[PDB]
Amino acid sequence: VTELSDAQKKQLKEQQEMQQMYDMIMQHKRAMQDMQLLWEKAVQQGTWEHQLRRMEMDKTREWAEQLTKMGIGDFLPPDELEKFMETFKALKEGREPDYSEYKEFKLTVENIGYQMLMKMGW
Amino acid sequence: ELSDAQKKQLKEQQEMQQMYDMIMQHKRAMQDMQLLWEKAVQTWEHQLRRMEMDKTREWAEQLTKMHFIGDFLPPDELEKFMETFKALKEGREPDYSEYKEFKLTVENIGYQMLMKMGW
Numbered sequence: 001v002t003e004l005s006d007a008q009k010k011q012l013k014e015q016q017e018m019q020q021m022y023d024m025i026m027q028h029k030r031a032m033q034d035m036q037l038l039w040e041k042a043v044q045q046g047t048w049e050h051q052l053r054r055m056e057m058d059k060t061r062e063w064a065e066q067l068t069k070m071g072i073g074d075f076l077p078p079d080e081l082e083k084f085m086e087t088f089k090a091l092k093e094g095r096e097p098d099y100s101e102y103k104e105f106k107l108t109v110e111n112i113g114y115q116m117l118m119k120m121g122w
Numbered sequence: 123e124l125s126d127a128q129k130k131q132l133k134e135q136q137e138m139q140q141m142y143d144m145i146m147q148h149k150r151a152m153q154d155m156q157l158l159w160e161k162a163v164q165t166w167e168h169q170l171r172r173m174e175m176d177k178t179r180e181w182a183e184q185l186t187k188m189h190f191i192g193d194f195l196p197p198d199e200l201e202k203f204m205e206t207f208k209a210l211k212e213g214r215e216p217d218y219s220e221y222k223e224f225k226l227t228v229e230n231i232g233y234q235m236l237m238k239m240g241w
Binding site: 104 | 142145156160196219222223226227229230233234236237240241
């Protein structure tokens with residue numbers, strides 16, 4: 001989009017940024033649903049559940065990477081931040097965190113995603 | 123005299139703004155409990171933690187008043203969610219990692235219903 005005023009560049013970047021935050025949240029929701037059905041069908045048949053788990057963990061790490069580039073200490077109190085970053089680190093290094101902390105990290109990532117969308121609206 | 127289409131806009135706008143308000147007020151109440159709990163950490167810290175769980179439990183009852191929660195969780199996640207919810211209702215104290223995940227799940231459900239209204 002060429003020849004915008006400064007006013008126009010500001011409105012448009014906000015619109016597109018809200019829209020991308022939204023689309024990414026729906027993408028992450030889509031991919032999680034797909035992982036879900038994959039597991040519902042594998043159980044309709046042990047080593048599979050751990051494979052699906054690792055695939056899911058990598059998609060969650062990706063979505064967290066996307067969120068970082070969209071913006072977070074602003075969202076977490078000190079103790080939660082250290083744990084969040086630790087788990088993020090293990091996922092990045094390809095290690096497998098404790099399942100309960102992975103679940104906590106995943107919910108936290110989705111939680112921050114929503115808070116960001118909410119700050120862009122409103 | 124508003125038209126039918128205009129009443130619908132007005133009603134949708136109010137329900138959204140009412141949903142936005144309740145989320146913001148719950149968030150601020152969680153921020154207060156977090157701040158008070160941090161200063162209990164330089165028991166009382168445990169007592170502030172228990173009231174926080176109660177405020178989460180109240181928030182979850184509030185959202186439910188608006189069947190409709192199994193819309194957000196696959197049936198496995200649904201079961202754990204209701205066990206923790208029922209533990210809280212009955213005055214039991216769950217595993218703290220069981221509570222944290224219920225807290226975050228409750229919150230993400232609130233964000234999702236706001237999101238449905240707004241998009």
